[PDB]
Enzyme design. Structure first.
Site, PDB file in Angstrom:
ATOM      1  N   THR D  98       8.820 -21.403   7.570  1.00 17.25           N
ATOM      2  CA  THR D  98       9.021 -20.868   6.110  1.00 17.25           C
ATOM      3  C   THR D  98       8.067 -20.739   5.042  1.00 17.25           C
ATOM      4  OG1 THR D  98      11.489 -21.229   6.166  1.00 17.25           O
ATOM      5  CG2 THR D  98      10.033 -20.934   3.664  1.00 17.25           C
ATOM      6  N   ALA D 121       3.382 -25.653   8.905  1.00 23.48           N
ATOM      7  CA  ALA D 121       1.343 -25.495   9.396  1.00 23.48           C
ATOM      8  C   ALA D 121       1.494 -23.819   8.594  1.00 23.48           C
ATOM      9  CB  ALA D 121       1.587 -25.342  10.933  1.00 23.48           C
ATOM     10  N   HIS D 154      -7.519  -4.642   9.543  1.00 21.63           N
ATOM     11  CA  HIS D 154      -6.008  -4.680   9.790  1.00 21.63           C
ATOM     12  C   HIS D 154      -5.515  -3.430   9.236  1.00 21.63           C
ATOM     13  CE1 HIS D 154      -5.826  -9.188   9.253  1.00 21.63           C
ATOM     14  NE2 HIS D 154      -4.576  -8.648   9.525  1.00 21.63           N
ATOM     15  N   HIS D 155      -4.212  -3.399   9.588  1.00 17.07           N
ATOM     16  CA  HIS D 155      -3.556  -1.950   9.199  1.00 17.07           C
ATOM     17  C   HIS D 155      -3.827  -1.152   7.605  1.00 17.07           C
ATOM     18  CE1 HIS D 155      -0.271  -3.375   7.260  1.00 17.07           C
ATOM     19  NE2 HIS D 155      -0.900  -4.719   8.087  1.00 17.07           N
ATOM     20  N   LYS D 158      -1.549  -2.971   4.541  1.00 19.91           N
ATOM     21  CA  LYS D 158      -2.271  -4.201   4.220  1.00 19.91           C
ATOM     22  C   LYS D 158      -3.147  -4.181   3.040  1.00 19.91           C
ATOM     23  CE  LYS D 158      -3.891  -8.736   5.904  1.00 19.91           C
ATOM     24  NZ  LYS D 158      -2.545  -9.061   5.392  1.00 19.91           N
TER      25      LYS D 158
END
Lengths: 267, 268, 266, 267
Positions: D98, D121, D154-155, D158
């Site tokens: 989360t 993590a 990245h796309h 973003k």
């Protein structure tokens, strides 16, 4: 600071090592050539293209060992044999990069390492040795969850495929994964190969132009991929590693060392 | 233009509906097999773009008047009947069915004598662009570069190199006047010796779930030029087919391919 | 076969140009140096490291023009001014790669090019000129459906970003797409940049080590990507292009030519 | 064999996690959704696209914790708080992914980790965590001899630059080298930048198309270069790492663990 002597200081590799010594901030302790060389008396710095540095090329290693803490030797296997005896009696460590030493000459090296510190490595490039450690570490973690492919590129004159460095990398991965490289290696793909076996280590070798040397290992999983890549701009990054090994080995216990020791990779 | 989608129920059909709407066009029709379950459902909702007011039919002939062009990515038998119907109605068709029979492909050429027909081996705009770049770079470089073809695909692919890689290698050999079967090399092991300039080398990478990457290296002395196509997913055929569909509307009845659609024959 | 003369044959670029002439199979027609140079009389082939070739270094360009059909000049703009006037009277074509000519000197070139054939290009690397043509073609086809990003890498000593080659590539695309590069160019990204404007041409500049020079243009679409990349191994791929331009221009009508003309890209 | 329960089993990530549990050969111990969900009663395997597996979606975690040795939670920080209390009282380990927990909510985790084993993590991709370890190791060896540049892609949607993963990598490298990232970071280059400072860590951020996510770190030296690269094919490689952590943590001492522990990366 450590005093580094360069043996075979006249050759192509010797000059690069002289630049590497000065670029690392070290003192060039000696520059030795064959006793009959034309260059005896010339300035090592001038000969290396870095301007005068006050060290002249001499033809007797025994006469200059007191000026050195370590020597770097990239010459002939016969010349390395004579260089080993002089360093032993003088107590000077030696960094050896001479290729193609006989099994008897290699045994003479191993026994010398019981008296003086000796560095012997298949590759002195810092980047290559680092790459191997990364490959081993990624291989232990990925285990059998990734398809491993080795891609290398070299100039059109290279007669061997894959390169020794590519095979060195595949060997380290195969040792880490407990595989037999000769069994799981694949060097080409044509026609109906069927689906890929997870044990396979694939070697794709590119040949063309004047490419100095690129090596990439792909750990290819489901949804992701990790690549470790080493690329060489010139044939000279042995020098920086060799000089770094020479500075590292000064004053250490008499054993045989490799670049894994020098770079702190055996952890 | 009003664009209709044939085989609108399948995976590829649904993607084509998205491509028509994503390109701003009005979906003219959505047709499925006459025994398909979904007949009557709204094409937009089924494609995930919300209702658009077009429903799935099992009769292509009943909606041809509602279309200016239709796109067919199905089975070779389904296209043959669809090719015959489009001829009589005067509606253009873009065909991407793979493995069409020798008789069906001949039926296409005669159909293309009555209606405009687009038929291409690959409808990805990027792939077609790349091959033109390859031809152009190859003609200029000539015999001064060593040419290597690198492709990567998932671990399930059984055939090597990919059809796209061979399509690219074939384009290069034709530009250079070479016979690909004679000059191709698919692996390197042992004392290979120095590289022959005529050699075209194929390096094939297999692993994981790589959708499809292709790189051509023109490797010279002191420099190198690379042309690379990379695919994120298996859906970039759709944008090209929709682009071919819009392009072919209202044109003279011939057989066209993606070089015509993308204007690639116009530079040499 | 054409007889090619090399100007500034003593310098680094001159020696490389001599090698390129011999590597292409041509006969070196002449080798000229500064009138105060030490090397006048020495052999050009030996001086260039390819062994003796029977051509000696001269200090007078006017005295050797009769032995050449074309000359290649990679020198200083002031020396090029003397070379432009001299080549005009002798009727010998000239290939010029001297950087940084003044607006007046470039005008002197354009008027010279009305009398003799003159090749003038910003970059003589065959690969770079090909790359720009691939970019123009890809840009015309993709149109406004792809995000265009220019990535280049160079050694840590380069003081200018992006490189001239990268901007040359970016400009060619902007012209194709009808965009104004100064308006649509982006050279960094930090913080909440928001979503990407389709008009943007982004420049990512990598600096480090001793990288000679890498240029990549990405046409990034939905589902796919096409990359055109040029990589340089050394600083010598200008020479082969210049020699190829020299052989190409021999015996042609007096105009100003560039590498697009030589390589048949126009 | 560990019994792994999936919380939020109806959502996008929940369905992916169910695939990951079955693909690893583990037993799906539970599949939990909100007690008012439409999906209560559906088969988890069918919902995940892998066909029936015989575990149905339930709305009560407390009623099914006895069927689990570990549970995986990618939900909202408020829901993770409730699951921690239930797992604590039941003595079942939990793997939490989360995002965005408060400093107090993170404290509830740390006190819980004294009672049950807890894995938390920042990123559960096996390849990314491997990549980060590789960067730390290469940075330690190279030291100040290389220019370090982080390149990510990245796309076009973003909004943040560079990505959190790219910043995470620079942070690992800057910590290893004793540098302050905010002091040495550079995010663009335009005009007469001058020569490169060796301390600089450069960030080149590529934006375009629908690129899922690519990250490359270049260690650029004199004559050579080493690159570590991670590429994502889809947004689903968190799942395998989370499942791998779930099996790893079963039956271990109650502490707080991360993916460095799970993958054996600490040393």
């Amino acid at each position: 600071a450590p005093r580094i002597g360069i043996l075979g200081a006249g050759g192509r590799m010797g000059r690069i090592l002289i630049q590497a010594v000065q670029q690392a901030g070290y003192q060039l302790g000696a520059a030795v050539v064959r006793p009959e060389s034309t260059l005896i008396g010339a300035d090592a710095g001038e000969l290396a293209g870095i301007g005068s540095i006050g060290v002249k090329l001499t033809g007797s290693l025994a006469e200059v060992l007191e000026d050195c803490d370590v020597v770097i030797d990239f010459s002939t296997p016969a010349a390395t044999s004579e260089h080993l005896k002089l360093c032993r009696e003088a107590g000077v460590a030696i960094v050896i990069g001479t290729t193609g030493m006989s099994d008897e000459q290699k045994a003479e090296l191993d026994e010398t390492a019981k008296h003086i510190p000796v560095v012997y490595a298949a590759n002195y490039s810092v980047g290559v040795n680092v790459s191997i450690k990364l490959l081993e570490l990624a291989a232990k973690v990925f285990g059998d969850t990734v398809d491993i492919e080795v891609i290398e590129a070299h100039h059109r004159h290279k007669v061997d495929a894959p390169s020794g460095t590519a095979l060195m990398m595949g060997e380290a991965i195969a040792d880490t994964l407990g595989r037999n490289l000769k069994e799981v290696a694949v060097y080409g793909r044509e026609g109906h190969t069927g689906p890929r076996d997870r044990q396979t280590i694939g070697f794709e070798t590119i040949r063309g132009g004047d490419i100095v040397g690129e090596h990439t290992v792909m750990f290819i999983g489901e949804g992701e991929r990790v690549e470790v890549t080493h690329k060489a701009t010139n044939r000279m990054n042995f020098a920086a590693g060799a000089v770094r090994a020479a500075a590292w080995v000064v004053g250490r216990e008499a054993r045989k060392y490799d670049m894994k020791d020098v770079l702190g990779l055996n952890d």
